[PDB]
Structures are given as C-alpha cells and as structure tokens.
Amino acid sequence: QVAFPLQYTPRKFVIHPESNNLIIIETDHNAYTEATKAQRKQQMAEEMVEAAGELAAEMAAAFLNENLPESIFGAPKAGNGQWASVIRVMNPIQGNTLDLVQLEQNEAAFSVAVCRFSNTGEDWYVLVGVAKDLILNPRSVAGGFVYTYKLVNNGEKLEFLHKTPVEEVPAAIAPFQGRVLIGVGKLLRVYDLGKKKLLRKCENKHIANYISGIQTI
C-alpha cells in the first residue's frame, strides 16, 4: 500500500479519464469545516477576555496559535445538525493534492459524477449532488442542491459553475446517453445541462420508498 492522508471521511471517488486524477468527496457528521472552527475559534477567543480578570494574561494568542495534528487528537467535532463536506483533486501517482474545494457549513455531498453532455463538447464536468440540513434520526432535510464544476486545466483545475437548488437530497448521479440521470428522494429524473441551472427532461414518481443508487448500461 501507500497511505495518503485526508481530512473528512470520503463517501466516494470518481475517475477522471483524461486528466487521470482522482476527485474525492469527504463528509463528516457532527463536524465543523475549517472556517467553522475559525468562527468558534475566534468566538471562544473573544469570550475568554470577558471574564474581566487581570486582561493582562492572554492564553488566547497561544491557544489559537496552537494547532493540533488532526489525526492524533482526533475530531474537535460535536453538535447534531452540523456537517463537513470537502472535495479534492489528488494525483494517483503521488500523494499531492491538486486542488481542494471547501464547501458550506451543513451541506453534505453524497454523490458526484464526471461526464460530458452530448450537446456540448469535450468540456469535462464535475457534478456534485449535495444535501442540505440533515436531521438524521427522525428523517428530514431542509432541501437539496447540486453544484457544477468545469474541471479545467485539462482537468487539473476546478471552478464553481452554478448552484442549482432542488427540493430533495440526491442520493446518486449517473450519466445516460450524453445527459445526466439524477434520482432524488424517491423520484427518478432525467436531467439535461442548462447553462444557468439544470432542467428536468423527465421524471417518474412511482418508486415508493427511496432511491439509493443507480447504474446505467
């Protein structure tokens, strides 16, 4: 083997054929993304001095200066509705990370697919299906979203294209005949690329319970 460290817990990864790189989706429950630990960081930093004690002694600058290796002390993580989701462009040959995508607070990404719409050209696409505000054990959500990335620098660079909202959490994404299948909740839908947001080119409401995963010959 060889071990390449990561941050959050990857739920899946996909091959990018031509750039021959690896796109990794990471998610952690009860978790705080970097900026979140920065706002709680500075939050406690502020709440220290307010004890009004002699003010003079600051452990705040050293404490914040202290940054612990995240593996040895594990997860500085708690809270119910909070999440962490990160994307990564990593070389297969070596362990270097080509790019790192740092997403919103509560949004967990359970699917990603890389394909090329038959209408457009060879331009690659990174489609990240994302869930919004999971309340895990009752079952509910605030809704869902899908993020789109053009996968540039022959696939060695990513850029955010658009944020397209959707009522429900996508559990899987698969390409079919030059266009993109997405089941969402229990509803199966055929999506085609919009240049602002995706549009639905079909739907089926029959499937009773939920859509877990999808494969396409």
Partner: protein, 66 residues
C-alpha cells in the same frame, strides 16, 4: 412458547409487535460487528456511544404505549 420472548398470539397489538421487531433489530445491531461499524461511520460517534444510545432506546422505542 410463552416463556420464549417475542411469542405472538391472536390478540397481539400493533405496538407490541413493532416494539418487538425494534428490540430484536437492536440486538442484531449489538450482534454484528460490521453493521454496528456502519452506524458509527454514518453518524459520527464511538462504537461505545452507539451501543449506549441503543441500550437507551431498548425500552422506549416508539415511545409510550397506547
């Protein structure tokens, strides 16, 4: 049969049958190392805290009876 817990009969209520299958599911979770580990992965906790929350949910599940 009676002294074998989970025994049903013609007068069996909904609530009792479903709380049965609940508790049995939970004993399966305590039982299988993996599926337990799956739970720990999904919702982030220790194996321990998982089993603890389950053992809390053993008597309750569905909540009060009718």
């Amino acid at each position: 049969q009676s002294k074998y817990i989970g025994t049903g009969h013609a007068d069996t209520t909904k609530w009792e049958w479903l709380v049965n299958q609940h508790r049995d599911s939970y004993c399966s979770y305590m039982g299988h190392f993996d599926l337990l580990n799956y739970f720990a992965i999904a919702e982030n906790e220790s194996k321990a805290r998982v089993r603890f929350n389950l053992m809390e949910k053993m008597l309750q599940p569905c909540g009060p009876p009718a």
